[PDB]
């Protein structure tokens, strides 16, 4: 489980900062409420789609697991890479997702909790 401040620093390093007009707080909150700072977290779906990575990227439209029928695999990368401990691929395809046009509204956790809240407080007190 990566540290909150450590996770924010990693996101800043990977370039996710200042992307699509969202601060680090939005991304940190989304990760926290999507996988509780646990990149290994894996979740299924009612339709059968699988979610991998800290940001819980859906398999149906984003990553190519091969287990989900009619997969659009927008990420164009295997879901295993997202399931990898490092968050580089997660950050990259999250940039892609937020670049879809609807912003961070795609992620359910961000809308539920990280939308219209003090997201920047997540990176507070982290010496970043």
């Amino acid at each position: 489980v990566f540290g909150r401040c450590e996770l924010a620093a990693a996101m800043k390093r990977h370039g996710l900062d200042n992307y699509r007009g969202y601060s680090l707080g939005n991304w940190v909150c989304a990760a926290k409420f999507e996988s509780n700072f646990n990149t290994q977290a894996t979740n299924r779906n009612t339709d059968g789609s699988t979610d991998y990575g800290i940001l819980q990227i859906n398999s149906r439209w984003w990553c190519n697991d091969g287990r989900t029928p009619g997969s659009r695999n927008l990420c164009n990368i295997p879901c295993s890479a997202l399931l990898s401990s490092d968050i580089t691929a997660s950050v990259n395809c999250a940039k892609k997702i937020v670049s879809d046009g609807n912003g961070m509204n795609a992620w359910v956790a961000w809308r539920n909790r990280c939308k219209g809240t003090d997201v920047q407080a997540w990176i507070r007190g982290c010496r970043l």
Partner: nanobody
Amino acid sequence: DVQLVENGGGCVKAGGSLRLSCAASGSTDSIEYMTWFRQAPGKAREGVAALYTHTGNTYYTDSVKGRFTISQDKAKNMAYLRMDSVKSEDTAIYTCGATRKAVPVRFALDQSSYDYWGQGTQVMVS
């Protein structure tokens, strides 16, 4: 558990303004996209006016560009499609599809993507 219903339709001469309405029930919160699909006789079901509940962005096919507008109300979890300057080709059965997952913009008009559908409402042009 979202059930889609449609209201309106009927005979509307060329240039008549028709107000089609759609509603959602049950777990309406999970809904992400709302789209209208026309099942023209002899043609496959095709999207008409896609929409995203939260952002409110509206996407329309080329044919209905500048003539049909779709808007929704968050409180009532309903979406209604305005119609104007209707023509002969507009005669078809309109279906208000919905989905519980965030579909990409390019697939917003795809019928297969949507996981919900409702009883289509027929639209005829005099």
